[PDB]
Design a protein around this ligand. Sequence first.
Ligand code: HEM
Ligand code: HEM
Ligand code: HEM
Ligand code: HEM
Lengths: 141, 141, 146, 146
Amino acid sequence: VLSPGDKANVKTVWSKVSGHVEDYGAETLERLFRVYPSTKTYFPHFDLHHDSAQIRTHGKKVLTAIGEAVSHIDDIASALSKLSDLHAQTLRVDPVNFKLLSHSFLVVLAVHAPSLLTPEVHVSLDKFLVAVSNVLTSKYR
Amino acid sequence: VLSPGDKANVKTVWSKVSGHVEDYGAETLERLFRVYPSTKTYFPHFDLHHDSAQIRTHGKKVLTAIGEAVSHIDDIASALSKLSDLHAQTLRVDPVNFKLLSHSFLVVLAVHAPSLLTPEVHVSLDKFLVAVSNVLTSKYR
Amino acid sequence: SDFTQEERQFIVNLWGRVDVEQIGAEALARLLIVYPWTQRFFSSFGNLSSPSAILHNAKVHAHGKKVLTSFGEAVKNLDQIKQTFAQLSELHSDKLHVDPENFKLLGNILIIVLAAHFGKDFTPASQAAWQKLVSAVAHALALRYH
Amino acid sequence: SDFTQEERQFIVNLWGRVDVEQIGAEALARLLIVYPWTQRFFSSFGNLSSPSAILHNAKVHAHGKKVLTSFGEAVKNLDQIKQTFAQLSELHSDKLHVDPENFKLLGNILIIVLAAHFGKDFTPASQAAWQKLVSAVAHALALRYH
Ligand code: HEM
Ligand code: HEM
Ligand code: HEM
Ligand code: HEM
């Protein structure tokens, strides 16, 4: 359960992510693909050349999707009911990968805003990232 | 998250469990030990003879512990903060077993109150039983 | 030795009084509402939007019966279960990439569904023999190599 | 081939600039608040009641440094990691029955802790080489037989 503490901690971090949604999103996918080559199989039709156009563009889509969940933090499901069916029913993406992505992102945050990614804050957005993954993978709550 | 629906569904089931806390508790441990022999290793000092005195007495302790969580359903943690340290820090019981027990119990309910254990109800108390296990195993929420 | 004659008795006799249609359909419909994420694997089965819709979905009913008929193959030959579910293993694994722990969730609902149906006859010992069988099945449906 | 010379370079060079005291203590303290249930394994380490208490606990600091020193054994001999963590495997498994996936949680925090410390130098490729190492370690610490 996301406590008001987690909520605000999530919002503070996202205030430093906003204004970089494309850069951080692009670096998030880069680490994911480079550190976990198996995640590339979901993108046969992409020009996956480390840092290409589709990587940065898709990266922005993902990180923007996150920001939405930060806006509708109180009801993350509804604000993702679309992407859920995509990733869950259509794509049927293996749930593990969501943890690899959630992880890849925390690593980006550690690089650019280490002092901010304190342990209590780290705990918060990792609770939030799990809240996001469960939705995109579908769960009865 | 336990919705008001789950809450009431949990309370309805427990109204049929109340007045049998010892019988159902005794049968819960019996199936656990008989169906999953490995769970017996946690009780070297018990007279584990299928249906002995310590089985029924310990069974009542467990099912009574459950009932408490049904009373304080809104704040299950606090009403179990004692047993949590026991099972988590002291006993350090393997988390899997909690699912085997939670399962053993649903099987008892299916036997004695099948019509009541409807699918929506089954969903509810299984969300509640997982809420109970997480507490007794310790989790940051 | 996989099973004992005592367990074999519990499995075979209990299986004899089993209606594959009702139990199979009950197990599948219950699996899909209790563990909603297993629905992802069932994209072509129509309406699965609500518990009530699942319970009345005809594709779920039909497929539920085929599943229980499959459990019947294990019963016919307990000591060769693995070889029996050889085809189904590659389908559920290599083709339909299904999480292995799902076969376990489905074995848990079947046991609960059996308990609700057979009541007190589904004694601890009988349940013990069925856990081994459903467990044996779930295992055989998960091949790593060959 | 376990690693490549390119990865070896990323591992050895990065490891050379690593302060085992600070990083090791940071990794352990972070593991215990982010994943609170790992605390159960640390019953004799005193106060772990709050994030602040963990961060200031001296037993955590000390043990955190020994963990990172251990990661140093892997670095010295990358192709023989398994044989190196042979003793630690039986301790973490046979003795201290630790869930295997916990070694993975701890590898995730270390990588995050390394990223926070080395910033932009902890490039995707460098991170890739470290995931293999921390992954290799977590694996070796989980023996099924012999
Ligand atoms: C925080 C977790 C994630 C978020 C917020 C997210 C978000 C998105 C968004 C916004 C889209 C665009 C959908 C559209 O245009 O309608 C998308 C597509 C897609 N996603 Fe994800 N995603 C996540 C995780 C993952 C993971 C872990 C994978 C698997 C490795 C994945 C695989 C894909 C694929 C294959 C597409 C379609 C891309 C295309 O054809 O253009 N996603 N995602
Ligand atoms: C719903 C889950 C559970 C509940 C509500 C529960 C409840 C309890 C209670 C009330 C006690 C008595 C504590 C006291 O007297 O202070 C107890 C003790 C104990 N529990 Fe559990 N328990 C659960 C799960 C488990 C599991 C899964 C195991 C492992 C197989 C386990 C192993 C033990 C042991 C070894 C003791 C001490 C018994 C003794 O020495 O008398 N518990 N539990
Ligand atoms: C362990 C017990 C299981 C048994 C005995 C079993 C049995 C079967 C059988 C006999 C079929 C073939 C029916 C046909 O010819 O179309 C089948 C297919 C299928 N199974 Fe299972 N199954 C089990 C578990 C699962 C689980 C856990 C899942 C996923 C959550 C699953 C998902 C599917 C799907 C999606 C199909 C294909 C559906 C179709 O043909 O349209 N099964 N299974
Ligand atoms: C995979 C990375 C890990 C490494 C390199 C590592 C290393 C070590 C070392 C060197 C020791 C011995 C220190 C001594 O002599 O007392 C030790 C002991 C210990 N480890 Fe780990 N460890 C790892 C992961 C874990 C995990 C994931 C857990 C549990 C969540 C854990 C729990 C413990 C405990 C409880 C002890 C004994 C504490 C004591 O001596 O008082 N370790 N480990």
